[PDB]
Design a protein around this ligand. Sequence first.
Ligand SMILES: *[C@@H]1O[C@H](CO)[C@@H](O[C@@H]2O[C@H](CO)[C@@H](O)[C@H](O)[C@H]2NC(C)=O)[C@H](O)[C@H]1NC(C)=O
Lengths: 50, 50
Amino acid sequence: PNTGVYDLSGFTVKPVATVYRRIPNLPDCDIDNWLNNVSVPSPLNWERRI
Amino acid sequence: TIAGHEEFIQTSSPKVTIDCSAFVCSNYAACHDLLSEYGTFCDNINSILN
Ligand SMILES: *[C@@H]1O[C@H](CO)[C@@H](O[C@@H]2O[C@H](CO)[C@@H](O)[C@H](O)[C@H]2NC(C)=O)[C@H](O)[C@H]1NC(C)=O
């Protein structure tokens, strides 16, 4: 090649450290705050939550 | 008497360089693979600006 000044492109990539804020809809149901309840009912009078 | 007045003549302009592949297909490799078949399109732009 000839005597000159050549513009040579360099690169950088970044795949890591995403953030993903979301502003979600409703508050979580918290099933596990009910399944870890203390007063467990017996098979005659089982409970149910919807 | 003697009168003075001034005038301005422009002799130059700002020198602008453009990295054509960074402008079109910034960091994304699929875009670079697609742009590689227009071929001699960014080189004509670079040579005109030089
Ligand atoms: C486990 O389930 C019971 C429901 O049987 C929850 O009991 C409630 O406790 C509050 C305490 O302030 C009472 O005012 C309510 O009347 C109770 N509900 C009923 C239907 O009796 C209890 O809170 C649950 N445990 C947790 C951690 O949520």
